[PDB]
Amino acid sequence: TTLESYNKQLQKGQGTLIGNWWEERELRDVTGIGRSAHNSVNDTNERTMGKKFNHIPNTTNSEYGKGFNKADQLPRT
Amino acid sequence: MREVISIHVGQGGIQVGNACWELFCLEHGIQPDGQMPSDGDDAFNTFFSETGAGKHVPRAVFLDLEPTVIDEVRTGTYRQLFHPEQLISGKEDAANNFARGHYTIGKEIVDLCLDRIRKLADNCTGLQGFLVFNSVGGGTGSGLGSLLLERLSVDYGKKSKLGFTIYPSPQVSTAVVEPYNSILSTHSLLEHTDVAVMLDNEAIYDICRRNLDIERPTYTNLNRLIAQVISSLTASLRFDGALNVDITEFQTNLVPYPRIHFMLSSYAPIISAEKAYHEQLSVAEITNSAFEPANMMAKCDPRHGKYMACSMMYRGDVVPKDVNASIATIKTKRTIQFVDWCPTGFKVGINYQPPTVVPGGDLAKVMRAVCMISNSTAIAEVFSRLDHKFDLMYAKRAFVHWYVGEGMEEGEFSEAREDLAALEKDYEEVGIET
Amino acid sequence: DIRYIFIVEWFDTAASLIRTYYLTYFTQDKTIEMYDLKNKKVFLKRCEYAIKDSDLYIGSILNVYSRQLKIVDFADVFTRSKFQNIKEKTFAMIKPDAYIHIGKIISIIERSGLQISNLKMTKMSQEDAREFYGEHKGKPFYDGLVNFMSSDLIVGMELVGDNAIKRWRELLGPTNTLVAREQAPNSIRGLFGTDGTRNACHGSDSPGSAFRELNFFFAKTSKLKTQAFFNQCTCCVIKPHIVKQNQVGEVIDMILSEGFEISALQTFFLDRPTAEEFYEVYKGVLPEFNAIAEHLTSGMCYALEVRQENAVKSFRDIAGPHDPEIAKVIRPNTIRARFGIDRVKNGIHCTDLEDDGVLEVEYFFNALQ
Amino acid sequence: NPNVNPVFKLAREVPSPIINKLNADLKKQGPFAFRSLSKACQKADTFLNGSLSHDEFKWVIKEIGFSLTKTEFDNLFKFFDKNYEGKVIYSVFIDLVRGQQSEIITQSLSQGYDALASNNGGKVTVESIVQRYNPLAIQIIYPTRKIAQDLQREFVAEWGGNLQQQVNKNAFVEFFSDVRAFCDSESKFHQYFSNAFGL
Amino acid sequence: NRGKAVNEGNYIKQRLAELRVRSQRALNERRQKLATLLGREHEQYKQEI
Amino acid sequence: MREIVHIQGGQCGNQIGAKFWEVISDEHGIDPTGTYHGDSDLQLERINVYYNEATGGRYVPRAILMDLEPGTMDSVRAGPFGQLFRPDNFVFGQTGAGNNWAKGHYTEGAELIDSVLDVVRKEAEGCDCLQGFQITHSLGGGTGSGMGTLLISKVREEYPDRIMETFSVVPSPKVSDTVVEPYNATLSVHQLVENADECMVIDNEALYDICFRTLKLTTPTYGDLNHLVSAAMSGVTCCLRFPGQLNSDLRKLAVNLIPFPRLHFFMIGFAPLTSRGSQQYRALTVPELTQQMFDAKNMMCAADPRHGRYLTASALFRGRMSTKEVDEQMLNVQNKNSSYFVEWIPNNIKSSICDIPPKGLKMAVTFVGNSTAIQEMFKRVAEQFTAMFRRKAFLHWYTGEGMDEMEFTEAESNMNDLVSEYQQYQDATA
């Protein structure tokens, strides 16, 4: 365990390119607080979960009644 | 002046009934609201009762011990049709324990259910019989449904009862204690129901895939096939035809013996929206597709047993002879053998109303089809597997402590295996040749 | 390069359901490739069918490989922008000074590049005329314009295309006709305008107004019935292949110059099953019925009502042979000869039976109204 | 009970996170991105009545570069379409999304328009705005490496092709107001006003 | 009592066809003249050409 | 209908429950003001399960916050979401536990337990129809471990049929947070087996391993760890709040997860957990979810499941999936691993589905496992306890408040008997 170490508080930039640099890079792009915001409160939801694709799908039980076949509405003769 | 009463219980029962009533309502021109504009034969008395002006109501009885699924019927796409008080709902779930659903919580809904059923029967005038869908590999259906069947029998007697049960499969199932739930339900049903149909889950998947080229189906798709089978079974009673079939003509035609009355069904042809119009779908080939081993809806190999009685109901514009030609073809085919004491073992009805397809369905429009609901001694295997599982898992009192606490006796389990063994022995003996 | 995309759905007859296809459009070398969104199978790939450039747009139709498609909506970012420019709107209108010059004004319009998307037949009733030109009440031009609108027949058109709100104006020429001749001799006003009150034609001055004027004419709730009388007249139909070839105007004046008093020109969209009910007179009769009907449902078609002292046969004379091929050799000065192409796509078609003249004209103008 | 409020809801509320997050993303596109949304609004509305249809909104929205999920669109349409009349005014859409306009900023915006018209005698034209400005004044709001020679290219491209197009005073406030949303401080935006217009 | 609909309803079908016969036969004849018109019409142009 | 009650204690319990309430309020649409800003109509039909309503319309949590020292309760209120709790449900002492059982369970707690019991009973009687109680408490902590077990015992004694859930953050073999960790640890489990219904151990050490091996955050904080357990709890109760194809309740698992009365120790897990970098580069399929959930490292328990067997386990899927995919993957996992599941039980894998997934994610699952691997957890704790009891270490404190050495004697005997009886089945064969 020799993480941290050769990289102090710096905003933006390619960093120090030592150890595990890539993983934390995106976060600072995602929002503030590169790691363990000093004691700019860090929202715990931001780190653990990941990208958000926000939508609530239909019940999928209410999928029976809804169904249409346009080819049944032609005037015919 | 003929009608039927439908009994729906359990989660799977409710979902299957949803599709069945969808097909029924679409087949008669009654929109979801309950109004039927048409634009008039009394073809709608079989399942629906006129409300006085326009709107109708289905003779449905719904029961479940949990509010989750009952509510959705009251908040979905059919909220203005069903009777406001005929959707009986519980307060707590059974939790997949047979004891819970048969002696303490299941005894405080029987009174209400009997009241509703009595009102339905009184309003009905020519009640032909009962149609029951229930699941056994679960909590609510096995116990509540069995007790309801017991009470219905003790109340009415000679009225016939038909059961489209939902049993477990060989390898694909949800419950880890499902076997125990099955045996008690079977012990209850064997001596009080008349005709039952095995409709396991696994078999439906295979047909769905291998025909409709849908490798990722869902329960909803499986529901539609069962709904279609039910509709084809019950159509003859209400639609005009030349060779009609009355549900009364299954007890006296498709149950050789009072005890051995278990039979497995199938449905076809099932062709998608692409492979539909480039084939022949003629009467001759469709019959041969009905008897193929893999097509049947129950995971029961037919080739491993004799046939004892089979009934077929054609629909559409079939001509009678082609029914005869197919019958002769299957009879002559050596691959299929018939029991030594059933010389004439087919009973065919021909109807006229063509098959109808629900919107957006996987089934493309067709003009002929056969709904084989035959019975065969091959069903022995399914009871063998459940009995073997029961023995293996009851050898050393696993999960037992749950049951004894709810009221069930320890010695009850002894009876169930006894009856199952007796039934297995009866099946083995009956098929022997003279 | 750049690729154009579209969404297509086809209404089969054998298969009840209706699919959705792609019809990829390579603009580099005039090629058509069709793919289906569902089931992920290449449907039709990289083969030219020689579809003209202007045909592709929402609301139209085009027939390819015995299957007739109908682009319904756009698919991707780039496709919309390129053609989205062609959606502007404007209402055209021709006053009853040029009634004898109806055929010509139709012709020159197609040259400019605009399109005649629809056209009907009305004589402006006095009662509902007043609601029109509402903004002109105050000026003395009101009363003068009142009666003239109600005098005789009028023709209304809708133009769909680029800058139609102004491109119509510039060609249509200044308002006053007299001044047009000095400055714009080659303009609509210059060639067919007598005085200010008898200015030949008009255009919508403002878009927001441009929405107003049409809602009066082609809206479903319209107070302009198809004025016509159903006695002593014979009907002819400009078949679809003409409205694509841009001679609709040319055919119109030719009949007018023969002494026939035209009463209406209207557009109808009718599908395959409806079409068959018109040619039933030829259902199994001589003309090899099956082939013709399928074409009439390959695009719009104008319907013409014609009159004369003797209706049925006289008009037939100038229309004095079903196949144009025989027409060219022995009747060079007949309508069919000039525009006919083949056995089944022969230009005009006028009734060829004495006693059924009334009904056929009635059907286009009474039952389908 | 006055000490206890009943909260509840008597009027619909702007959904918020669907609308705000559009503000954050739309920030990153660039100074003229805000103008991009407005222009795409007019271009779709080539009919001059005041709005866009149901689906076209999807078309109009999915051109700027936001591929929102259905609900993301689901919430927005309910708040904007009060009674499902079938149309929602797009003009209101822009006023709510970009942000808020201060009276001083609008007053400053109008003053520049009057000054620009004063040199031309009350007449307006894109040539005057194209001919006189500071392309480096855009540097203050956000720095850049692009050459000043090309900057003039962006200003004409974001404008109309013709140099004689009519310009209205109401348009002048709208045009700058589109730019302002990109800047995060009122002081920075107005200093560009002077620097760009030399006032 | 319900038989009234069948008695009256059954009447509807049989008459409908009968009315059809007049519609067709009246429709058939005019089919006869048309073939004559074009035929003789075509025959001339064979000589004329 | 069938609403549940949540009870938390100690600092660890307070933090875990606060974060759980945060996540639940976020998902159900409850904001810091306690007002409704929901979008889908589906967000209120079963709201009463975790929230009540009163005049004014600010939904309130039916939770309990309590401890023997005032600081922790003071800290929770000050932060955001601290205004949702009923100001009355704060029951606190005035002395502190100090990591000694007797100071928590016999004298001080007995003096204080009356108020907590009264509040719990009032809330229960108020609620329409109880379903069961879930408790978050730490065995290694002083105050919670003792008086929390007293609370559980009293509640179970008062209510015979309602089921009890227990989440325990047991000590870890390497990273220790107390010089007397096993005392309050072993005895707590000794007393818990006879009363608590469902216990699901959660290990701190696993969180650090799981975090730095998958999530990949350079400097994690307690706030982050709390969130994973919070999501696990939230998923534990999915069907009871939202509709689906095949709903499942807490009782269902008990009949499906507890073959024997005394074997009710479960281990949990969560997925799909992915770092902030690879979120968009990995598919989301029933197959890809399957391998991760059984992934040996992904399980939250200190002991790797690959050292024992599996008797019964359930997976509660959430979101729109296709059942066909669900069952087939279960058969694959149960078959291709011919020796990881006891041979005398057929179909020992559970399935479940719900039709509403957590906000901001496509599909995820919660795995509950009755795994014999836990034997190392108890054996290590019991081994250390016996090693440090061989020398009568620290006993004078415990013996000083009504604790006799023989009572400790009973606890270790119970522990060893549980370990032996639980391990028997690994060698037992049909």
Ligand SMILES: Nc1nc2c(ncn2[C@@H]2O[C@H](COP(=O)(O)OP(=O)(O)OP(=O)(O)O)[C@@H](O)[C@H]2O)c(=O)[nH]1
């Ligand atoms: N094929 C099919 N089977 C279903 C469906 N719904 C439920 N089942 C069956 O139901 C079994 C599980 O039982 P539950 O879902 O709990 O329903 P139940 O048997 O009434 O038990 P309860 O929980 O008390 O409702 C599964 O093994 C399925 O076989 C369905 O829609 N299609």
Ligand SMILES: Nc1nc2c(ncn2[C@@H]2O[C@H](COP(=O)(O)OP(=O)(O)O)[C@@H](O)[C@H]2O)c(=O)[nH]1
């Ligand atoms: N993961 C995690 N563990 C915690 C947290 N707070 C406390 N703990 C654990 O809980 C134990 C301390 O328990 P404590 O709250 O003091 O209980 P008490 O001694 O009875 O008051 C320590 O061993 C920690 O491992 C937290 O915020 N996150």
Ligand SMILES: [Mg+2]
């Ligand atoms: Mg239920």
